[PDB]
Every structure is written in C-alpha cells, then in structure tokens.
Amino acid sequence: DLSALNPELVQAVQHVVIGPSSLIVHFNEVIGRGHFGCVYHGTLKIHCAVKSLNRIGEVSQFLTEGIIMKDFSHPNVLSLLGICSPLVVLPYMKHGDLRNFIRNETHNPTVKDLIGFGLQVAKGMKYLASKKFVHRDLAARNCMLDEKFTVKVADFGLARDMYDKEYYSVHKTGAKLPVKWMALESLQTQKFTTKSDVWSFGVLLWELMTRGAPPYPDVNTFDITVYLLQGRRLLQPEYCPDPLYEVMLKCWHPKAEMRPSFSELVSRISAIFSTFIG
Numbered sequence: 001d002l003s004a005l006n007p008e009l010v011q012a013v014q015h016v017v018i019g020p021s022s023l024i025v026h027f028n029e030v031i032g033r034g035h036f037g038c039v040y041h042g043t044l045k046i047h048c049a050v051k052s053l054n055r056i057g058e059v060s061q062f063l064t065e066g067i068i069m070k071d072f073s074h075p076n077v078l079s080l081l082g083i084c085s086p087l088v089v090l091p092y093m094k095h096g097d098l099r100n101f102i103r104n105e106t107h108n109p110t111v112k113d114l115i116g117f118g119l120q121v122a123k124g125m126k127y128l129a130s131k132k133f134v135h136r137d138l139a140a141r142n143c144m145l146d147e148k149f150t151v152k153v154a155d156f157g158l159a160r161d162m163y164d165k166e167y168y169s170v171h172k173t174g175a176k177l178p179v180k181w182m183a184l185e186s187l188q189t190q191k192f193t194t195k196s197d198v199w200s201f202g203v204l205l206w207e208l209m210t211r212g213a214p215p216y217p218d219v220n221t222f223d224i225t226v227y228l229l230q231g232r233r234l235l236q237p238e239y240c241p242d243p244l245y246e247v248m249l250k251c252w253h254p255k256a257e258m259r260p261s262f263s264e265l266v267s268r269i270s271a272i273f274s275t276f277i278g
C-alpha cells in the first residue's frame with residue numbers, strides 16, 4: 001500500500017523490496033536465535049543472513065524503518081540488503097558476533113587487534129551518531145565480524161532483537177533492558193541518548209580487553225545503580241593500556257554531556273592503537 005507511505009519515500013520502495021524469486025533461504029539450519037525470530041543462511045550469488053520475525057505492527061512503518069536503514073552505508077555498520085511474516089535480509093557475517101569471537105579458543109587476537117576491533121566500533125558509532133541515530137543496545141554481543149574480520153555495529157533497525165536474553169532485565173515499565181551496559185541516567189529515566197551509547201561503548205571496550213568477560217558478575221541486575229553510586233567502575237583489565245582505561249573512565253563520566261563524542265573516541269583510540277606493533 002504505497003498510498004499510506006510518506007510521499008517522499010515511495011520511490012525508495014523498489015530499492016528496499018526483494019522479490020521472492022531472487023532469494024533462496026535455508027530453513028534447515030538455524031544460525032542465530034533472537035527473541036523475535038530465527039536467522040538462516042540465504043543466497044541472494046551473494047551470501048546473506050535471513051531473519052524471521054515469526055515469534056513476534058503498521059506495515060507502512062516497517063517499510064519506512066527499512067528505507068531509513070538501507071540508506072545507511074558504512075564499512076563498520078551492518079547494512080540492510082532488503083526485505084522479502086516479512087523476512088529481513090542482511091549481509092552474511094561469517095565470524096558471528098564480536099563477543100563470541102573474542103571468547104573463542106580458536107583465533108588469537110593480539111592486544112593491538114582488540115583495540116582495533118574497538119576503533120572500528122567507534123567509527124561505526126561515529127557514523128550512526130552523525131545520522132542522529134541512537135543505538136540503545138551497544139554491546140560486544142551486538143556487533144559482528146565478516147570474512148575479512150571487519151567489525152560492524154549491528155542489532156539495529158529491522159535487525160534489532162535480544163540475541164542473548166541473559167543480559168536483559170525486566171523493569172515500572174515491563175521493558176527488558178541491558179542494565180549492565182546502561183548509563184546511570186538511563187537506568188533512572190529509561191531515556192537513551194548518544195551520550196548513553198558512549199557509556200555502553202566504554203563497557204564494550206572493557207569486554208574487548210577482557211576477551212568477553214561478563215561485566216559486574218557479582219552484581220545482581222538492577223542493584224547496578226546502587227553499586228555504581230557507591231563510587232565504582234569496572235576495573236582495569238590486565239592487558240588494557242593505561243590510556244585506554246582512561247578512555248573508558250571518560251565514557252563513564254557521571255555527567256553525560258562531559259563524556260567524549262564518538263569522533264573524539266576515534267581520535268584517541270587511533271592514537272593508542274598506533275603505538276602497538278603486531
């Protein structure tokens with residue numbers, strides 16, 4: 001129903017919609033499980049990941065969401081190939097999510113590699129933030145790697161889901177929130193900003209430098225606000241450089257407006273990264 005869309009967006013429908021004859025989808029093996037649906041191998045011949053929304057609004061809104069997301073193009077942001085319940089068609093990310101990749105006893109990223117994964121995330125977020133887009137759920141689980149180990153910020157738009165339900169807690173609005181990645185003010189208000197994405201990014205850097213350790217494991221869910229207000233932050237991982245820890249502390253500034261922009265994070269991290277060999 002093209003009449004129900006913003007007249008500005010009608011021309012973009014032909015570029016976001018995938019005709020079912022162009023897409024093969026392999027429902028025989030699940031590759032990813034989200035709360036809203038499963039993910040499967042797909043051949044579009046380009047390799048893709050096809051996300052079902054089986055488990056789950058306005059069809060017009062679903063399309064506008066897809067049109068917004070398809071226009072996003074950055075090497076460190078997961079693209080939308082198109083839509084085909086509607087199926088979400090995404091580039092295939094061979095090496096899965098960042099957290100599982102750094103936890104994997106196969107592959108041996110160096111400290112330089114790990115900082116580089118962080119830098120890539122920062123550049124993806126710099127792009128997203130320049131598009132005035134707030135991610136709300138930045139974490140290592142929610143970023144992915146392709147065949148060339150290019151890290152991409154994912155889990156947004158039509159790809160948004162809870163892909164690891166363990167790290168989401170019920171608030172009172174029944175919202176299921178990633179409390180251990182959330183900024184102080186967001187835990188209090190449930191409002192998310194680019195500056196709260198910056199807090200989440202600091203936690204992500206910590207994940208990278210610990211190779212995917214769970215943050216605050218001896219804290220129980222929403223008692224995190226209490227824990228933080230005692231004057232606490234995540235401790236410096238053994239292999240995390242001093243200046244990288246200083247960056248994390250800046251990301252966790254009590255005053256949202258004093259946290260660094262993603263541009264500044266790209267600048268600071270590029271510098272630290274350049275000091276390393278191998």
Ligand SMILES: COc1ccc2c(OCc3nnc4ccc(-c5ccccc5)nn34)ccnc2c1
Pocket residue numbers: 031032033039049051078090091092093094095096097141142143144154155156159160163164
């Ligand atoms: C080789 O195996 C896969 C599996 C799922 C994929 C995929 O699912 C959609 C998606 N979009 N954004 C995100 C962010 C995080 C996760 C995720 C999935 C499982 C476990 C943990 C996290 N999926 N995810 C997209 C593209 N490539 C994929 C490749």
